Design a protein around this ligand. Structure first.
Ligand SMILES: Cc1ccc(S(=O)(=O)n2ccc(C(=O)NCc3ncco3)c2)cc1
Ligand SMILES: Cc1ccc(S(=O)(=O)n2ccc(C(=O)NCc3ncco3)c2)cc1
Ligand SMILES: Cc1ccc(S(=O)(=O)n2ccc(C(=O)NCc3ncco3)c2)cc1
Ligand SMILES: Cc1ccc(S(=O)(=O)n2ccc(C(=O)NCc3ncco3)c2)cc1
Ligand SMILES: [K+]
Ligand SMILES: [K+]
Ligand SMILES: [K+]
Ligand SMILES: [K+]
Lengths: 328, 328, 328, 328
């Protein structure tokens, strides 16, 4: 029945105390008791409680005692509204689900997001080791492998051993060591042997900002990969079956076509849904053609639906990383 | 000729009553009659009508008695403005068509959007039945089908019958039962027979949130599929005709090329507009090459025009579903 | 040196008259002369000029006499700010070029954007005529064309003549008639003859809202087509030359490869830049492979750069058309 | 302990001087000393300091002495807030990294972004020279090159020499001259010889606005090219190795498949990651098929992650160029 005047920095808001006592735990509710005159800045000639805060968002906080819900403005960023919430006693978890995903979310994007002359003296050997690995397989140095290649990689491993004689000698305590510095253990005496020779680049690929952002993205968006894989698996199964039966109705067995099984149809339905189209297997009857024309479009759609959700994350994280790089 | 002072929560707005009587059905219009002093909170010393509401949107409501049109702000969400509209007596259908699609919509996105150990004991059998179906066709277990596969699927159907001896016994009343629990009716005694064996996954594909959002999208956007199909059909017809005639002018019949008919040109014009390109049929004359270079681009455009409209829906619905999942 | 108080609807703005006389043609400038007391609503006890307008944008208008430039807010739509501009005497062409493309935009998107039982009795004949045209070419009804097909199309043309005996008889005056109702002139006595038989669908393709929006888009964005064609032509020329010379350095003539000319390289460079890839012509030397790996990416980029500009137009126009369809 | 009233144009903001002395270098801090009454517009009856500026952003400036951080509003553009910052003494480099990339951003998009009858008399010769170059290679005018083609290009070079007899004669001082007007030096007496004949179009391709915007984009976004190249190189290396070993486990050498080396796998892994798919090399074992189905998706993702960042730049720059073209 009575009115009180919350003067939030020059621009006074009036309300009924019956409105302020809707949520009795927060700070504003304390104003309503007949004791607040002994706690806050009560000017005893205009009866207004001074509160020296941003007056352009407090009219959205107070629009949580008036109606009953709490929304976020669109004229302030996340952290500004969050600081104001934290002040006034409101909880940052009553935000309605419409104004929540565009308010969390810079808070979910923070995400913790002269020996510099031998770093190149290690990168050079990393790259030459990658090259020697990629050339050991070529059937030009295998008339039986030529000796100069194993000599080169011997120099590489005798330098990597030298570098591994400091990361255990001068380190204080006791990921990129056990299953990533394995080729050093290997050369001294092939799939799992030398796949790891190429993994050493993931050691230095943390000093580049773009790959740090990519790594943070590939783990802050780990649901939109299950989603994409499940979409693609459903599509592959459905369209493999459809194309098998379609090609079958088009005239003692299936010897006039490529899709002889439902399994082998998975290869086709995945080189078609992705709009790849090698050309090893394609439809050859009008029913097969209709099913393929359906498959291409369904694939475009079920791939383009979650990939934008994946991509906005990288956009935001990379924008933040560059903004942090371009500021002192 | 007279002025009145609508004090909407501390920040008074003045107007002429001649402005407030533009729409005589709403609440504000009642203020103008020489009786409102007996209805509302009329402070009889400053002559201001108190109205204890958000003062940052009421200056957009009142900007519907001043000009004549009603627009929505961009510093508040949908539901906030909608609640304020509902209060003041304004109708939410006078919104101009520019400020309408970005005001409807969180209202069109709500869209209604220990026996948990046998659910896995049903999913296991669903998956093994899918696998046995996909392996019955392979020409490795058909020297004539091997007996262990029909034995396996017999175990599967004798478990699904057991599970179907409760969904009719203990159910109160009397979609996923008639045309989805058909293989149980089948095995006891092939296209329409066993296509349905794979449909059982659509029973469990409602417990995943991503597929619920996909299902809601595929039906809240059922116009943008007719649109895409019509675009693609027009493109296919036009470019099939163009490529037939083009390949024809390039020198007694058409025995030097692939496009011998206007029908068979549909397959090409749809594996090209989608940027698929198998390679079974391609142009082989300079006029055919120009028409194909036109077809690829027209296809990219007439596919990328409505697909973003389809994709924004999934983006919004999935954002809402995740926000609702991440909040108590 | 003196201050005056523009009371724009309850929320008074103070300024110096020396500020208001920056642009002497507009309305506000009239307030500054020592005569405005005889023109406007001058309350001669608080010395404030009443102006009964939106007080949330006038603080952006007045921020054109203070600094010297004119910007648009982001908390109001286009037409709202435009109406306020039109009132205050400001011109809508002084808007700075940053706040202009997001202010023009609904103004550039307006863009002018029981005989209903014989419309189907014409669409049926249109479709059957399209089908008879597409089947006249097939080498199944050409053992020499079978008589039933020309009989069918004779029925079609004898109905279209009947319908053309009203659009000249009962029309008041004197596009879709001369070069679109040509087959009627044709059958009574082949490229340009019967391409037009398929054009009749563009007569009815104006009653669908999606194709109306597509037609408005394809002409409100006629610069972003010259742009795309020029990008693609530059790319095609550059990469055709590059791939010719590359494939040439890889070891008396060029008889070991596909790219024997710079012209024929255009076909490849356009089925590759569009990520189509038929497979009729591909690189076969390491230099050719590097150039092709460059071509694919340059094509993706120079196609994806203007296509989003093309697509936003359709997005906006279609949103507007649907908003206008969903409102009385 | 004391309060002061910054009247920023009609809408007074109150604060404690203890708040205004948080940053003692800026202008507002001067208000707090017991001398400001002799410097600013101090009305000595309401004790308010007049400051005649936009009152809708100063409540965000002052929200930098209250909390400690500085954010940008979303209801004003970049340059407006920047002008207000510049006024008040605040530095435009304390902006928090969330509100920075959407505040820089028009400032990072400005970026410096009757002889007109012989310009066509040069473009004609440029185009005919391009055509003669592209036709010198064709094996239709090489029965040995026909004389009319070298005659034509002789006319072209004797006109380009004439035009090069003015750009050195009447030019005041002493890029598009040394390595771009080289064919004139060439014809008077082939890879590096005549690649440059096509470079002359880059001389005139600065008079088109679309290509000016493209050129500004291709250099304001030179990090997102290193990023894309590094993503693609990592992908190519990883998936080349994976597909080699996969195809190897699928059953004395590798004579049953295409991927015989890790190098040649780069061609495949780059015509697949880009969703090109020629069809010259594809997987032929189930493990190869799984790895290829992984490669297509990883390629789609690692290409679509930085390309939107590249594309937004062209969008913004082109919008600005068109807005500047459409305004006096
Ligand atoms: C000391 C130092 C300074 C700068 C950088 S660095 O950040 O500038 N930098 C250089 C190369 C890479 C890289 O990760 N290359 C991967 C690759 N491409 C093809 C095969 O492997 C990153 C690293 C170390
Ligand atoms: C009781 C329970 C708990 C969780 C889930 S669940 O939601 O986590 N869940 C699991 C599998 C699927 C699925 O739909 N798989 C489809 C498919 N992929 C390849 C062929 O078929 C969904 C379901 C039930
Ligand atoms: C009287 C009336 C009512 C509705 C419509 S209508 O708007 O609903 N409508 C129907 C078909 C089309 C169309 O344009 N079809 C093109 C096509 N597809 C394949 C070949 O040609 C549009 C038209 C007329
Ligand atoms: C005097 C004047 C006026 C207008 C223009 S102009 O700006 O309108 N203009 C015209 C052609 C181009 C162009 O760059 N063409 C490239 C190309 N396409 C295929 C091969 O090469 C640009 C230029 C000069
Ligand atoms: K493709
Ligand atoms: K392809
Ligand atoms: K392709
Ligand atoms: K292909």
């Amino acid at each position: 029945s009575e009115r009180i005047v919350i003067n939030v920095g020059g621009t006074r808001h009036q309300t009924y105390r019956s409105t302020l006592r809707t949520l009795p735990g927060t700070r504003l509710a304390w104003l309503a008791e007949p004791d607040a005159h002994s706690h806050f800045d009560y000017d005893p000639r205009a009866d207004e409680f001074f509160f020296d805060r941003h007056p352009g968002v407090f009219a959205h906080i107070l629009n949580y005692y008036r109606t009953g819900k709490l929304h976020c403005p669109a004229d302030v960023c996340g952290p500004l509204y969050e600081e104001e919430l934290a002040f006034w006693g409101i909880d940052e978890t009553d935000v309605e689900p419409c104004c929540w995903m565009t308010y969390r979310q810079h808070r979910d994007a923070e995400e913790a997001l002269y020996a510099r002359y031998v770093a190149f003296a290690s990168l050079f050997f990393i790259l030459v080791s990658i090259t020697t690995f990629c050339l050991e397989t070529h059937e030009r140095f295998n008339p039986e492998t030529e000796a100069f290649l194993t000599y080169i990689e011997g120099v590489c491993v005798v330098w990597f051993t030298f570098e591994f004689l400091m990361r255990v000698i001068f380190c204080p305590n006791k990921i990129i060591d056990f299953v990533a510095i394995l080729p050093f253990y290997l050369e001294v005496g092939l799939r799992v042997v030398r796949f790891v020779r190429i993994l050493r680049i993931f050691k230095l690929t943390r000093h580049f900002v773009g790959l740090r952002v990519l790594g943070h993205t590939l783990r802050a968006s780990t649901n939109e990969f299950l989603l994409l894989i499940i979409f693609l698996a459903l599509g592959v199964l459905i369209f493999a079956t459809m194309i098998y039966y379609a090609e079958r109705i088009g005239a003692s067995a299936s010897e006039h076509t490529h899709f002889k099984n439902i399994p082998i149809g998975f290869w086709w339905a995945v080189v078609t849904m992705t709009t790849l189209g090698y050309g090893d297997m394609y439809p050859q009857t009008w029913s097969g053609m209709l099913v393929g024309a359906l498959c291409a479009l369904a694939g475009v759609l079920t791939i383009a639906m979650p990939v934008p959700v994946i991509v906005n994350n990288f956009g935001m994280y990379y924008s933040l990383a560059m903004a942090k790089q371009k500021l002192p």
